[PDB]
Structures are given as C-alpha cells and as structure tokens.
Design a protein around this ligand. Structure first.
Ligand SMILES: [Ca+2]
Lengths: 4, 240
C-alpha cells in the first residue's frame, strides 16, 4: 500500500 | 484529493494543515483534525519523521493569505504505541499532537466531532474526504482545500478478494473506490467527514491508497477508524  | 471540488472556506472548520520546516519556509505534508483547542488528531505515518512541525488552522489556500489563519507550533507528539512505520497495513495509523498554544475558535476554526466508541457505518454511507493532497496520482498538491464525495465500503466488502482483501483491518474504514475520486499524497492524517443523524462527524483519519495509484477502481481510500480509538484518544488527552 501507499501511505498518503 | 483526486476528483474533488473546491470546498467552501467555512465548510470544514476542523480541518488543519500539518506542515514541516524546510529551509527558510514551511511545506504542507499532511492533514489533521482539530479535536481540542490544543490537540490535533492526525496519522502516525505523518509524524514518524524527525522534522519540526507546525499546525495551521483556519486555512483555505496554501499559497495566499486568507486572513483567517492561525499558526501554532507542535509541543508534543503522541503516536499510538502499536504503530509500526514499516507495517501500515497493520493499522494503528493515528497520532495526537499537543499544540504549543490553544487556538481561538470561530467560523473557520472549530473542533471536529468524533463518533461514539465502536460506531460502524452502514455500507455506502455518505462521507466527504477533505484535504490539500495531490489532485492526480503522482501529481501536485492543491492550492485550495478540496473535498470529494466518498461513500463508505463496509468491512465485509472492502476485505473481499476483489477489493483490499486481508490488507484492510476492522480497525479501518474504507471509502470511495469508484476509480475517479480518492484521497492522495498530502491528504493523509486528514478527516473523513460522515453525515450521521444530521450531523457530520469525523469517522476516519486518512491513511493509505493502492500501489497502483490514488484513484483505483475497487481500491477505496483507507482510513483509520476513529471510533476504534476513542478510549485511547481520551486517555492521552487526560494524561497530557
Ligand atoms: Ca492561506
């Protein structure tokens, strides 16, 4: 996942 | 926020801009929610870096004087004890910031309303994500606060194979995933405002998106479920  | 619209400047008064000092200026890095005159709720991954942070309340346009801003330094950072920087999918992506001073409340600066402990939203519940995050995957930050309508996707559906699978935990809230609208870098730590009983409450803290991109079909934006941390939040504030 990509932390935003 | 990808696929958002510009928010009216007095729609989300609990939204704050978390910024860090970079050289001789300040740079917006994340969002947050004002929960006490001297406390801000944000994502743990937003503050697990060794930077100097400040909070800006009453903010609308990051690049122009709005005549409503209040700037305050961060005095203490309390990250959830179970947070692990290299395991975002585990959850616990939440942190509380005690401000150096208590901000003044007005039409542009208000406390965010948090849901009762344990509250779970029905599937497809109306919510709005807000923030100054990228307006496109690998794009750039918005100048003015953006908002996007992101209906919730319940745990059962969100944790299914076609969606996030086991990546999502029950301690999280999923919203959106229509492939057009979503949160994106820079929105992290910010609020997910959901309408319940005629009142908007902050049910989520923006946490993560897909590796494929911000706005990806069946990959709704994932938020830390605020109602799962009410006790923790109260415990921290009461002891600090
Ligand atoms: Ca401004």
């Amino acid at each position: 996942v990509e932390p935003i | 926020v990808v696929g958002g619209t510009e928010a009216q400047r007095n729609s989300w008064p609990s939204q704050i801009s978390l910024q860090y000092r970079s050289g001789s200026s300040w740079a917006h890095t994340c969002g947050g929610t004002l929960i006490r005159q001297n406390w801000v709720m944000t994502a743990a991954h937003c503050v697990d870096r060794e930077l100097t942070f400040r909070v800006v309340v009453g903010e609308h346009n990051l690049n122009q004087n709005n005549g409503t801003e209040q700037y305050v330094g961060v005095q203490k950072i309390v990250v959830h004890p179970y947070w692990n920087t290299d395991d975002v999918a585990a959850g616990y992506d939440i942190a509380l910031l005690r401000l150096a001073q208590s901000v003044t409340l007005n039409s542009y600066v208000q406390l965010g309303v948090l849901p009762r402990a344990g509250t779970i939203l029905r599937n497809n519940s109306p919510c709005y994500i807000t923030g100054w995050g990228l307006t496109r995957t690998n794009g750039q930050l918005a100048q003015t606060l953006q908002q996007a309508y992101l209906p919730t996707v319940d745990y059962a559906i969100c944790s299914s194979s076609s969606y996030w699978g086991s990546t999502v935990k029950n301690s999280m809230v999923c919203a959106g995933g229509d492939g057009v609208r979503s949160g994106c870098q820079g929105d992290s730590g910010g609020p997910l405002h959901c309408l319940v009983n005629g009142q908007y409450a902050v049910h989520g803290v923006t946490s993560f998106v897909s590796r494929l991109g911000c706005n990806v079909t069946r990959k709704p934006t994932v938020f830390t479920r605020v109602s799962a941390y009410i006790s923790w939040i109260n415990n921290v504030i009461a002891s600090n």
